[PDB]
Design a protein around this ligand. Sequence first.
Ligand SMILES: NC(=[NH2+])c1ccc2[nH]c(-c3ncccc3[O-])nc2c1
Ligand SMILES: [Ca+2]
Length: 223
Amino acid sequence: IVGGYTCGANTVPYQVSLNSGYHFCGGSLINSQWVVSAAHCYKSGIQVRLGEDNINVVEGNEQFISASKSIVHPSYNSNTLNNDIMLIKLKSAASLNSRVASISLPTSCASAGTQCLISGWGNTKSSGTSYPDVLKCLKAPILSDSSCKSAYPGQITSNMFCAGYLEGGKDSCQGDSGGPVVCSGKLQGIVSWGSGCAQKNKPGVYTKVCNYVSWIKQTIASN
Ligand SMILES: NC(=[NH2+])c1ccc2[nH]c(-c3ncccc3[O-])nc2c1
Ligand SMILES: [Ca+2]
């Protein structure tokens, strides 16, 4: 997260870290056995880490559970990143409490102007790599579709939305991929891509979760 602040241990109880010997992506807990992340974060050998704050120290509240299966959306395109969403089922359910909690799926899409919270352990520099130990937060608004399409002409599908600051300085970055964009208590986006990090006129692009709620409910219901 570039231009963000330290969230505070366990203030974001639905944030998960996807780990394969190191942190590589974020994700959101939506029920005690399912996590939603981005299809480009897929790999085998994923351990889901819940109740995390400092990812390099065990401090208490952490739950490490291995993933039983990862379901990348059947229509995910790795060249356009359209349908960039993946569901991970956990080997055992997580114990929920106030430090580990699920986030709700939306009942409607959000409008531009809505302010949202983006969090993650990804890069905090736009030029160079500086990964934090603790979780960083950034509050960003959803931009209008014209500013998003004018920024990435021909690269935005209707399953993507832009959120961020056109003046630059604040944005999500690598390491944040797969993580949450929560607005008014609902999971509205997933960190998917952007051109560099925090660059002027290059806002972040997120998977528009409101378009996958029926798919998520049907896939969890049949697995
Ligand atoms: N500007 C953003 N909001 C953003 C978000 C996620 C990213 N992930 C990446 C990224 N991911 C994997 C390898 C290199 C990257 O620059 N760039 C990213 C940029
Ligand atoms: Ca820790």
